[PDB]
Amino acid sequence: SHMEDYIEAIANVLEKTPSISDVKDIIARELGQVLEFEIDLYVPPDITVTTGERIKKEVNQIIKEIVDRKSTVKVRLFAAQEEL
């Protein structure tokens, strides 16, 4: 349940993080005392590899700051969906 509190705050931040177009999905589970996060994000289709690595680092910083306990963070980046 404190798990849902963390997810909500994480989503609130990510929504306001300009390098991220949208949150695709946030999953969390407990592995003993470790919280495991899987974060899927939409980003601009033209990002470079370096920018993508820099966004994963920002996401990781956000989680580490919000969650007091030990965590693992896996981030996946997807091209934002463009209008047809």
Numbering used by the authors: 187 to 270
Provide passages from the article that reported this PDB entry.
CDFs are utilized by MTB to transport iron cations from the bacterial cytoplasm into the magnetosome lumen during nanoparticle biomineralization. Like most CDFs, the magnetosome membrane-associated (Mam) proteins MamB and MamM share a common two-domain architecture consisting of a trans-membrane domain (TMD) and a cytosolic C-terminal domain (CTD). Here we studied magnetite cluster MamB and MamM CTD structures from a phylogenetically distant magnetotactic Deltaproteobacteria species, BW-1 (MamBBW-1 and MamMBW-1). Each MamBBW-1 and MamMBW-1 monomer consists of two alpha-helices and three beta-strands and is folded like-metallochaperone, similar to previous CDF-CTD crystal structures.
To obtain structural and biochemical information, recombinant His-tagged MamBBW-1 and MamMBW-1 CTDs (residues 190–270 and 213–293 respectively) were over- produced in E. coli cells. SAXS results showed that MamBBW-1 scattering curves are similar at concentrations of 1 and 5 mg mL-1, indicating that the molecular dimensions are independent of protein concentration over this concentration range. In contrast to MamMBW-1, MamBBW-1 crystal structure exists as a monomer and does not create the classical V-shape dimer in the crystal, yet superimposition of MamBBW-1 monomers over MamMBW-1 V-shape dimer implies that MamBBW-1 may in high probability form a V-shaped dimer under the right conditions. MamBBW-1 dimerization interface, similarly to all CDF-CTD structures, showed the typical parallel S-shaped backbone structure. Support for such dimerization can be found at the possible interaction between Val235-Pro231 and Ile233-Thr234 from each monomer. Additional support is given by the MamMBW-1 and MamBBW-1 electrostatic potential maps, showing that the top of MamBBW-1 monomer and the top of MamMBW-1 V-shaped dimer have hydrophobic and positive patches, while the lower parts have hydrophobic and negative electrostatic charges. As an alternative, MamBBW-1 different oligomeric state can also be explained by crystal contact and crystallization conditions that break the dimer and create alternative contacts with similar or lower energy. Putative BW-1 C.B is composed of Glu271 (MamMBW-1) or Glu224 (MamBBW-1) from each monomer. Trp269, Val307 (MamMBW-1) and Glu222, Lys260 (MamBBW-1) are also located at the hypothetical metal-binding site but are not predicted to be involved with metal chelation. Overall, based on our analysis, it can be assumed that the composition of amino acids within MamBBW-1 and MamMBW-1 putative metal-binding sites are suitable to coordinate and bind metal ions.
